[PDB]
C-alpha cells in the first residue's frame, strides 16, 4: 500500500511513502520514502519570459512544495506574448503560442 | 483549395563554431518544413524591434522530396561575430494559416547554443518534509 | 489568547518488543487560556472514553500564562496497521477550533530511503 | 525540533502497584532544581485496576540540545530489586537510517513519469 503525500507538478515531485511488512518478526515495520524529481536541464530562470539566464542553481525544499518560481511547465497552464506581425495589408494582431501542445486553448 | 493545413514546423540553426574563428561575421538561419500551402511570411524580431528587410534574404518554397504535399523554405541572416559575443538574441516568426495563432517564435543565443559546461548545484534537504 | 501546539509521540520500540501493548500520545502545550477540549477519532467513528486518559491543564515553569495538558493504549498487534488514531483539539484561540493532527504506523522515522531521482535533457514540461 | 526554539523530553512510568513512586532528573552527575521539571500525579490505569502511570516533562532549549549532554531520568520505587532504576537519552539515540540513493544522468535512457 503506497500512499502519495504530495504530487506537486509545478516542481514535478512525487513524494510518497510505503510500509513494508517484514518476515515472521515482531511488528516493528520499517518505513520507506521513495523520491523522484525532474529537471528541465535546458530551461531558464523565468520559464515563460525569454530573457532570464539559464537554470544553474536548483533548490528543492521538500516541505515548502507540500503546501515559488516552479521550474517545469504544466499540462495546460502557460504564459504567452504577442508579436507585431502584420501579415501584409490585412493586419493580424494575433496572440501567439510560446509552448506547442501546451498553450492550446483549454 | 484542396491542400490540408499541415503544421508548419520551424527550426533555428546558429552559426557553426568554426565560422567563429576568423572573427569576420556570423550566420543564423530559420527553416520551415512540412507544411501546405505556400505563401508563408517570415522575418526576424530583435527583442521586439523589427529588423530591416534588406539585411536578410529568404527562400522560395519548393516541394518536399519525401512528401509532395509538404513544402519547405529557409531564411538566412548575417550578423557580426561580436554581436553574438555580446549575446543579442533574435527570433524568427512564421505566418501560415495552419496554426490557429498563425505565429510561432523561438530564441537563439550563446547560452542556448550547445552548452559545453553544466553547472548543476541542486540542493536537497528536509527529507521528512511537512506534507499533510 | 495564543496558538496551541500539538505534537505526536509514537511508542518506543522497547515497549513494543514485549508483544503486549502500545501507547500513543499527542501532546498539546503552549496554549492560553486553560479549558481546552480534546477528542479522539478513529476511522471516522468516535473512540470510547475509557481507552484514553486525559490530563489537566497545568501551567509550565517556562511560560506562566501559557498552559499545557496531555492525553494518552492499544494492543500490540493493533498499531501495526496504524489506523492513525486521530486526535482533534478544540481551543478558543483557533480559526475554527480544529487543529487536527494524526500519525499512522507508516508515519514516523524512516529506516531507509532508496531515493532514486532521475534527470534528463528531454524535460521541462513534467512529462 | 523544526521550529528551532526549544525541546521537551518526557519520561513515562507505567504499571506499578502500589502508588508513591519517586522520580527526578540526573544531569551528568549533578541534580537539577525541581522547578525545571513537572511530574504528573499518580493516576489509576483504565485497563489494569491496581497499576498506575505517571509523566515527567522537562523543557530545555534546542541550542544546547545541539550538544550531546546526558539528560538521564531516574526513578525510585520499592518493587525494584535495588529500588532505583534510570535511563538516558541523546540526539544520537536514533537509528543508522541506511541510504540507498541512486542517480541517473543520461538523457538517452528511457524515463517514465
Numbering used by the authors:
A (entry chain J): 3 to 69, 98 to 136
B (entry chain A): 445 to 576
C (entry chain L): 449 to 520, 522 to 576
D (entry chain K): 464 to 576
Could you pull the original sentences from the published paper?
The P. falciparum protein PfEMP1(P. falciparum Erythrocyte Membrane Protein 1), expressed on the surface of IEs in a mutually exclusive manner, is responsible for the sequestration of IEs in various organs. It has been well established that in the case of PM, the PfEMP1 member VAR2CSA binds to low sulfated chondroitin sulfate A (CSA) or chondroitin sulfate proteoglycan (CSPG) expressed on placental intervillous tissue to mediate sequestration of IEs in the placenta. Human pentameric immunoglobulin M (IgM) binds to several types of PfEMP1, including VAR2CSA via its Fc domain. Human pentameric IgM in a low resolution cryo-AFM study revealed mushroom-shaped architecture that consists of 5 copies of monomeric IgM and a J chain (JC).
In order to understand this observation, we used cryo-EM to derive a 3.6 Å map of an IgM-VAR2CSA complex, which reveals that IgM is sandwiched between two molecules of VAR2CSA. Our structure also shows that DBL3X and DBL5ε directly interact with the Cµ4 of IgM, possibly leading to the steric hinderance in VAR2CSA interaction with its receptor. Further from the overall view of the interacting surface, we observed interaction between chains E, G and K of IgM with I chain of VAR2CSA and chains F, D and B chain of IgM with M chain of VAR2CSA. Also, chain E of IgM interacts with DBL3x, chain G of IgM interacts with both DBL3x and DBL5ε and chain K of IgM interacts with DBL5ε. Similarly, chain F of IgM interacts with DBL3x, chain D of IgM with DBL3x and DBL5ε and B of IgM with DBL5ε, suggesting very similar interactions on both faces. Further, when we analyzed buried surface area using PDBePISA both VAR2CSA and IgM junction have a total buried surface area of ~1350 Å2 on each face, further suggesting similar interfaces. However, Ala2280 that is distant from the interacting surface showed a large movement of 55.8 Å away from ID3, reflecting the huge shifts in the C-terminal domains of VAR2CSA and also suggesting that the regions away from IgM shift more than the region that are closer to the interfacing surface. This results in the formation of a closed architecture in C-terminus of VAR2CSA in the IgMVAR2CSA map that differs from the apo-VAR2CSA architecture. The clockwise and anti-clockwise rotation of the two VAR2CSA molecules on opposite faces of IgM juxtaposes C-termini of both VAR2CSA near the J chain, where IgM creates a wall between both VAR2CSA molecules and hinders its interaction with its receptor.
